[PDB]
Write a protein that binds this ligand. Structure first.
Ligand code: ZN
Ligand code: ZN
Ligand code: ZN
Ligand code: ZN
Length: 111
DNA sequence: CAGCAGGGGGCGC
DNA sequence: CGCCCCCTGCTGG
């Protein structure tokens, strides 16, 4: 396949090789028409443009909610509409938390 | 919890 | 190749 002479990243595609170079060169973006924000991937600039519009194409099929991202919509389904969900214990504490996002910020200021 | 973006991979065109 | 989605930290109410 293809290789990266910087971080030893491999990918079978040429476009995904240039996408990895955006993370090393820094800026290869376009610009935003309303806040001058600049994102490398063309898709992320499209979801940034979704911030300034009431476009929420992701709907919760249960409570008919609306979200700007599928993953954000996915979390709402996971923590608010499912009961028997596997929570996570702390490797150095005796508390139990739901999300890894909470686990990441927990170890930041607790450990 | 939600909102947000950064780093990928899947998959059709 | 190009569009969308995935999981991932991160932040504030
Ligand atoms: Zn690299
Ligand atoms: Zn903007
Ligand atoms: Zn819901
Ligand atoms: Zn802990």
């Amino acid at each position: 396949p293809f290789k990266c002479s910087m971080c030893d990243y491999a990918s079978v595609e040429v476009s995904k090789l240039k996408r990895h170079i955006r993370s090393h060169t820094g800026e290869r973006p376009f610009q935003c028409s309303l806040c001058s924000y600049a994102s490398r991937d063309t898709y992320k600039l499209k979801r940034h443009m979704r911030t300034h519009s009431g476009e929420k194409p992701y709907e919760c099929y249960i409570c008919h909610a609306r979200f700007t991202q599928s993953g954000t919509m996915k979390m709402h389904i996971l923590q608010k509409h499912t009961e028997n969900v596997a929570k996570f214990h702390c490797p150095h504490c005796d508390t139990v938390i739901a999300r890894k996002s909470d686990l990441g910020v927990h170890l930041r200021k607790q450990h």
